[PDB]
């Protein structure tokens, strides 16, 4: 009620970082 | 918001009326002393009991389920039967009756009467009339049947006894009376109470003098006038003079209700002008004070100074 | 990895507020043409102080 | 039956009488703090003999269901000024600290119940009610105010008043009064003691301090006294139990605020002297500030003059 | 402040109109006629007071 | 399992507050002594009563059906009316009032007030406010209206009496106060309590000496310093020296709270070095001990040895 | 925290505190974090270490984690409906605050090889994903303060 | 109303903090009993200041509805070891007596709630609940343990830890901690006294034994003291009320376990001596074992040296 | 669009003030 | 300006200052007259004063 939307949102997305791909 | 509406506003509470003392053999002669407390039961007939301050803001009351307790302050080793009845014609006065028999007999015939020994407790009720009559509020101006649903009498059937069954003679405080009410007010307003100033102001200008004698040592009854009939005051010493002799005065008051204080005077290389006394004034414009007069300066040096300070409040 | 919205959205607002109390010159203080303006008050939204806007 | 032993809400209604206003003219109006003329809380136990202050020393809690402050003029329409009022529900948000006058007024037409009106007509300033079930305590404001006071009525002046001929009035002037119709609900039966009743005043006198001595010979330094109540009306008198050789003169004067009745002095040669009395009301934080005038020659004083405070316990005071 | 705490009181400057009502009791007492010559609470139902503040 | 949920957890119990002693004629002067116990009613205001240890593991409480008993320890042959009321504005302080009449009158106007003689028992209740307010838990940091639903006052209406109706003068223990609660907590956590070590460790390294005099016989007040402000300790004697004379000392402590112990010394063909004293330390880093000095070796042989042992615990 | 000065009252309907690390998994320290709702009883008064860490997890919304991965420490709302005031405290604090985020350090640092690091460092950051509800439109002041002058002549010189 | 006089189950929840683990290296790891590193019961009144031990001195009985022991690492993944944990519901089935290391581990992956995990990750060891209605008592373990303890958490090490360069670490190392989320239900309101509160310590001293004398001249025999509590932390001091002629020297030394602070001696020639103090914790069966060093020449001793024990009553101890 | 309502409104209502009513 | 008298508690005024400001004074001399000169001036300030010259 009486609420402006999307004032100051944030979105986070993780990933990884392996030691070798070894294609 | 404004409403201009009138409603009832039923309320509840509990209160403290007073304490009670029983008559011994010596103080008991006839019916006038047989009774021992004649205390009205109205709303505006107390000194700050949550109804004598709360039945100031409405004109009309009507009890519903009042009741009066008795709580003792004595052991089981004493006994004096006493009774209690709330009469509802407040002009009925048992002092007219002279025979003690009929005095004890128009008392328990009332509906809400209880009879008990003063070593235990008991609740006396209030029996409310049938019609829709509402009793005014205020003090008792001229007539009483408008402003009292009831009075309260507490009597003393045969004299005290002791562990070995003998009547003692000394007066004695026994217990205390409480009250548990439910009443219905009406018509918001304020009843007046005489008040000439409604905010603090100190009368710190009055001045006087105390005469010392031409005698080495003697106590007097130095009096003060030009005061109100009855009020509270407080004295503070001070001095705007000179002297070079060993003077000394440690005066004291002569009163019974309020004599809590002291005064001192000493005038040489060391000085002492400390102290305060606070007192009540009898209904003359009068107050008695006594001196000490332990000084060696027989010759009159100069009279000292004092000052009252009247607090201009509702009434002193 | 954090991030927030790459969205530039307009938001519209309404209301009123208080600006100044205007004083008026007489005869002693009314000499030249510079003593004839009596308030200049900018109209940017950020010029006021104590207005909620 | 009787002896219920139960707690119940009791809703009540009425109308009351606050104090008359006093509009400032020209010789009393140069700052932001002159535009503000009455700072008056809107609690229950905050008056004398109103049927809401006397009626609140008999319960313990309250909540204004709906209140409104009503203005009534006592002036003709031919006079010209303009004033606004607002009720802040945060009694420790103070406008005592704003300097520029315009900011002082813009933060009044932001509160959600503010009004504006000439001092020749009438209008109701309402109170606004928080969205909670909170119950505020009665009685004097003891340690923190956010328990006791549900609002604070700030009335404040915009313009400067003036007659029909345009000549701005120099002195003060009574511009009507304020009445406060109300509806509130009390909960807990009890008695608060702070508004004591007459015929119980005692005139306590047990607090004995001592003035700090100077370090140099001629000086007019100052001194403050803490530990007093946040608001009262006291009186001082001198008190002296010491000795002297040469002069040891001194003359304290009243504190630096409105209330002042006289002077007080100390002088301890053969023409000895010890007299005086000052009246005052302690500031809202509960202290005072005096100023001294010492003019003696001895430096090894080692005998701070004593004093005294006394007060009448008659009401909130 | 005992003149406005009454439940049917009004306040006004003396250049406009008003209406001060009479607030009837809850019970049904009937008051007597004639000059009082007695206690007054039989022969009167109210008293109009007008003040100057 | 983890829940991350908050609930109420209504509980029940009964507790012991303290004991009660009534004032006699001599100790009774005015309103300050008229009151005799001013004991808050919060959850964390006791020394291990199952709620001052159990209202350590939640932040917020709210009583439901509390009540306070009075259980006497006196016969029916004594009487002194006393009253009791649980006030709910904990900043209301009856010590301000000076007239005893109004002091007894703001007390029974409270809802949960009871009035009784101290020869029988009575239950005083707790009247809970209307709204949903929850009171914090912990000690009273700076303000009190967050952390006390109520205090408890116990007064003394007119003085004691006797079998023959006379006021006695000596102080007297009368009864004891108990409590029967039902409360609803919330928000599991722990409030802190200052604790510098949480596990036992003995400080068995401290060392000192006692000087004997060059006099045949005299008692002294040998003092010790370098200790904590207030703590518990215990002394043990020992000796790592030599002597060939008839020595003898049987010292003793000078304390009031803890002086349970004895010490001995004897150094010849037979030996005695037994004893222990345990004591409290006043808030100076100080402790007083007295010697006996019944030895014949007037010449100073060598001063003896002693050792404290401080237990490093929560606080000593 | 600028836009809250336009309303007296607030209440966090929800909150949570992310941990956004900065290190690889070759550095290790259990660190423990919580939100206490009595903002006066504080941990600074404790003087041991074993009690400081068992009052930090007994709290009902606490989490434990090594500082090389994420977490979410929530805010545990009251059962009653008290609304807290805005602005700087200048008072008792239990009106103007709803919680306090404390973060602790239970273990010493350790490196790739299992030895203790000697020097301090920074390890990450902390967000706050919130929801809030304000009540009463107004404008609180801004605290203007200034300390008076004070001359200091208490040093005798020498040449 | 109040004064219920009723018994009711009260279910509660929370999380706690057990003690940190301490992995053994190489200079402290040669036996089966080094692989086992924490033997810690899982009762309620078995901690200090956890909200489950302090909260259980206020009821009398309990039953873990569901519990779980949670491991959290404090190490990098580049370190290598491997450890298992299990909760035995028969606290007097002891693995203290197994010798071969492999049998010690095979009897751990037989219990119906066992886990296995590296010391660089996390996992919950759950507790398993008997199929009965049994309620276990709180408090210290007094005579038999099958009334009080509902389980025993045995964590035990398989491998030997090592750095990234493969070099096995020689010293100990902290490998995380244990937290114990729980849900339990208490029944009977009361107070157990065994966890007394601070400001009630008394330092009892009334137990006076005597050392047995030797039979020969030079000897270093031993002696044990029974009748003490199953677990505590005591201290001894000497006590001597006897006589002598020639030397009568003796030097007792601390018991043969971890705890030791100093020494103690006896020597009764002209250069007399009587001093010392030893600290220790009694073994789980409630006794201790000292060793003596006597080097005197008299044989007709007939005067056994006395000693003393004292302890602080502050908690379970 | 994205507009909170009734942020800080004001409403004004005029009246008059004659010289006499002359009821 | 000194007085024209041997000994006299001579008052002295100062002008050319602000309506409110924290000032401080320091002494110095640039000549003599070869006799016994001595002055120990003191202030009469309405707040406080540290010492004297
Ligand atoms: Ca009758
Ligand atoms: Ca009759
Ligand atoms: Ca009347
Ligand atoms: Ca505000
Ligand atoms: Ca604010
Ligand atoms: Ca007629
Ligand atoms: Ca109260
Ligand atoms: Ca109160
Ligand atoms: Ca906390
Ligand atoms: Ca707390
Ligand atoms: Ca098994």
Numbering used by the authors:
A (entry chain C), I (entry chain C): 31 to 53
B (entry chain A), F (entry chain A): 56 to 371
C (entry chain C): 54 to 106
D (entry chain B), H (entry chain B): 55 to 371
E (entry chain C): 160 to 212
G (entry chain C): 107 to 265
J (entry chain C): 266 to 318
Quote the study on this structure.
The full-length MrNV CP is a polypeptide of 371 amino acids. The N-terminal arginine-rich region interacts with the RNA genome, while the C-terminal domain plays crucial roles in host cell attachment and internalisation.
We found that the MrNV capsid’s asymmetric unit is stabilised by 6 Ca2+ ions in a manner highly reminiscent of that seen in TBSV. CPC has a well-resolved NTA that allowed modelling from amino acid 31. Unlike the NTA of TBSV, however, which folds back to form an additional β-strand in CPC before going on to form a structure known as a β-annulus at the adjacent icosahedral 3-fold axis, the NTA of the MrNV CPC crosses the icosahedral 2-fold symmetry axis and inserts into a symmetry-related CPB. There is a large linker region between the S and P domains at amino acid residues 241–258. In the CC-dimer, this linker emerges from the S-domain β-jelly roll and forms a straight leg that is normal to the capsid surface. The interdomain linker in CPA and CPB, on the other hand, has 2 bends: one between residues Pro247 and Pro249, which causes the linker to make a right-angled turn, and another at Ile252–Gln254, which likewise causes a right-angled turn, restoring the path of the linker to its original radial orientation.
